């Protein structure tokens, strides 16, 4: 007699996995023992950051009349902020381009 | 052999903030790299914090302190609130 299986992600109301993060923490050689509340916190933080990035990128994509998202939109979304530009200030994005700007002295 | 990624979860999260937007494969690779990078940073900082205080376990306090140390500005406040809410909801049941 066993109850119906319920994933920890559903129990915590998340979308990102919790068992996989727990396994990675155990097998990554980080500490001797791992508590029972660390995976939930880590999954929640990762999901929040992903949602932030995806929302900004989707706004950038919809700005110039497109349906899908390409790396250029991700680069625009990341570079046009102030906190995400500080968290990813030493990261290169393939096929991203640069932010368009020109110095005022060069302009006629 | 079979590989693992975060594709299905990224798609699930995307279908909640923009219900009519797709994504290409290159952007998915970039997203996977981003998730791996952030995971590694937070885990390493938590391990160092646990090692400094002569402990041998990683709890939610270490993760919270690592999050407050890494993320800048209001991102730290929001992430801390989300994590606390998730932990409370999980432990209520």
């Amino acid at each position: 007699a066993r109850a119906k299986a319920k994933t920890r992600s559903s129990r915590a109301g998340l979308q990102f996995p919790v068992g996989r993060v727990h396994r990675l923490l155990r097998k990554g050689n980080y500490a001797e023992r791992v508590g029972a509340g660390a995976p939930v916190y880590l999954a929640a933080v990762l999901e929040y950051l992903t949602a932030e990035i995806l929302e900004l990128a989707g706004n950038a994509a919809r700005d110039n009349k497109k349906t899908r998202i390409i790396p250029r939109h991700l680069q625009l979304a990341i570079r046009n902020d102030e906190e995400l530009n500080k968290l990813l200030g030493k990261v290169t994005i393939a096929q991203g381009g640069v932010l368009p700007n020109i110095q005022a002295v060069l302009l006629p | 052999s079979r590989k693992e990624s975060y594709s299905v979860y990224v798609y699930k999260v995307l279908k909640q903030v923009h219900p009519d937007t797709g994504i290409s494969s290159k952007a998915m690779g970039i997203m996977n790299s981003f998730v791996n990078d952030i995971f590694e940073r937070i885990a390493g900082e938590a391990s160092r914090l646990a090692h400094y205080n002569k402990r041998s376990t990683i709890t939610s306090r270490e993760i919270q302190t690592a999050v407050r140390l890494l993320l800048p500005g209001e991102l730290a406040k929001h992430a801390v609130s989300e994590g606390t809410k998730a932990v409370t909801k999980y432990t209520s049941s």
């Binding site: 929040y48 949602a51 | 209001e74 929001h78």
Partner: peptide, 4 residues
């Protein structure tokens, strides 16, 4: 920002 997004979700509080």
């Amino acid at each position: 920002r997004s979700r509080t």
